Structure formats: structure tokens, C-alpha cells
Copies of this chain bind each other. A is one copy, B any other.
Amino acid sequence: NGQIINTYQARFGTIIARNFDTIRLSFQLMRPPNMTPAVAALFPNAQPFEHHATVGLTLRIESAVCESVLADASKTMLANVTSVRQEYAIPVGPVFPPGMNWTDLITNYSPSREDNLQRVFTVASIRSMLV
């Protein structure tokens, strides 16, 4: 909610975010003060710039806890619901995006979508207990 909960600086191995809804990544490209002849050759003082400096960052959420149902790697709830809807050619309803597209679902995850998704996911787990 715009309040800073966790902060990690120059730490890369594995971090914990205990409660959050926004991620703010900041990183700086610092021109190296000292360059060997090849490095100095890469970066001229003026144009053209044929080699472009880039600084990366990769952030993977390996596990988390959410009060709302979500698709994940381990569970098959979304897959089961989508498979059932596709097998019997269910017409697009007034709630979910056509084809149960998860990108559209999570892009506009409204409370009504949350309620319907939780209902269908719970029923999918109930069914998967048997089928």
C-alpha cells in the first residue's frame, strides 16, 4: 500500500518479502573508472555507440502465500477448469475472459472474478480428488 516493508541492497542470493504488493527495483550503470584497452575501445567519448552498456536484474518468486486463489506451477486447478470448459465448448460467460486466459484474468482480477475463480478452483480440487 505504498508503505516500504522490505529493503535489500546489494543482496542477490535469496531474500524474503514478508508482506508486499509492489516491487521497486533500482539499479545503476556506473561507467568503470579504469578500462583495459579493449574495454576503453568499446565505449567511445562520442557517437557512434556500437556497443551499448546494459545492467540486468532477475527476480523469481519461488514460493509465496496469497489470500486469493492464483495459478501456480504445482497445482492443476486452472488447467482442470480450462480443460473442462474447452472440452464441452462452453460459451464465453460474463465474468471470465474467453478461453480462461490467465493473463487477462490476472490483469483484471476483480472481486467478482476472484469469487468465481475461487468457487471453480475449489470445485476443481474436489473433482481431482476423484478423477
Interface residues, chain A, CB within 8 Å of chain B? Answer: 1-3, 6, 11, 13-14, 16, 18-19, 21, 62-65, 67, 71, 73-76, 78-79, 82-83, 86-87, 94, 100-103, 107-108, 110-113
Chain B nearest Cβ from A114, distance in angstroms: 11
**Residue in B62, B64, B103, B108 whose CB lies within 8 Å of A1:** B108
| Contact assessment for B71 and A18 in the assembled complex, using a CB-CB cutoff below 8 Å | no
**Residue in B6, B21, B102, B111 whose CB lies within 8 Å of A13:** B102
Residues of chain B within 8 A of A100, CB atoms compared: 16
Asked if A112 meets B62 with Cβ closer than 8 Å, knowing A16-B100, A18-B83, A18-B86, the reply is no
